[PDB]
Amino acid sequence: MKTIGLLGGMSWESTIPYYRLINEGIKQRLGGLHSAQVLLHSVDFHEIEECQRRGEWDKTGDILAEAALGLQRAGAEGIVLCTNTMHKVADAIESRCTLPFLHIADATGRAITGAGMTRVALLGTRYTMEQDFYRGRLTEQFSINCLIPEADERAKINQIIFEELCLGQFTEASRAYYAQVIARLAEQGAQGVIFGSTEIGLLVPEERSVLPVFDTAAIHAEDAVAFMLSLEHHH
């Protein structure tokens, strides 16, 4: 198998599910005591957030690209960035490090098009919803049309993420509000819904979404595994 390089610590808690799912996918596919060949670089998030909060995305891309190049030196053969929001600087990493870059939106695009769909909705942070980096990569690589909530809903959905889901509160009222938004977007033509982080999936089980759900982080880990074994899109 190929060795995967992980760019993580943003946050460390959200890195653990990449490591878990990658190892489980390898152990499922290879059998027995097989585990994943993984190189991980975990940042001090403090230093990233200081750049992000001042909008110094060039500094963040310089830090993350230097981290990728270190993994490549240690023998990684592909790069996974274990955060949606930091794909703001994916172009910095992809253009500077010659290793295949497995963009989070590309993994999801492959899943969306493998479900026969052209038109989806995206729920996440307001930043992730409103910036070009996620939805734009989907169109550029796939022609996938990506619907977002209106401005008032974006603000409510975000507030729910940072005031509740982030602090462990998965409440029915928030659950129902998301399912209502998903439903509105379904009636506008959305054929599936991308949940931009693990926690939205924690709040909204697929039973409660009227649309097929694409959990972008779990999908990302599963695509890493396909890459390491050279399967499907990576054969």
Ligand X SMILES: N[C@@H](CCC(=O)O)C(=O)O
In the complex, which residues of this chain contact its own copies (CB under 8 A)? 1, 9, 11-12, 15-16, 19-20, 23, 26, 30, 32-46, 49, 70-71, 73-75, 166-167
Q: Which contiguous run of DSSP H or E holds residue 92? A: helix 90-96
Judged by beta carbon, residue 37 or residue 113, the one nearer its own copies is 37
9, 45 in Cβ contact below 8 A? Answer: yes
CA–CA separation, 83 and 9 (whole Å): 9
Cβ-based nearer residue to ligand X, 183 or 202: 202
Contact 228, 203 (CB under 8 A): no
Provide, rounded to whole angstroms, the least separation between the CB of residue 175 and its own copies: 22
CB of 11 vs ligand X, minimal distance in Å: 7
Q: Is 52 annotated as a binding residue?
A: yes
113 is in an annotated binding site: no
Residue nearer to ligand X on the CB measure, 66 or 77 = 66
**Residue 84 annotated as part of some ligand binding site:** yes
Cβ atoms of 7 and 64 within 8 Å: the answer is yes
User: Cis (ω within 30 of 0) for the bond into 11?
Assistant: yes
Distance separating alpha carbons of residues 149 and 91, to the nearest angstrom: 26
The answer to the question of whether 98 is labelled as a binding residue is no
Which residue positions form the known binding site for L-glutamate?
10, 52, 83-85, 198-199
Which residue positions form the known binding site?
10, 52, 83-85, 198-199
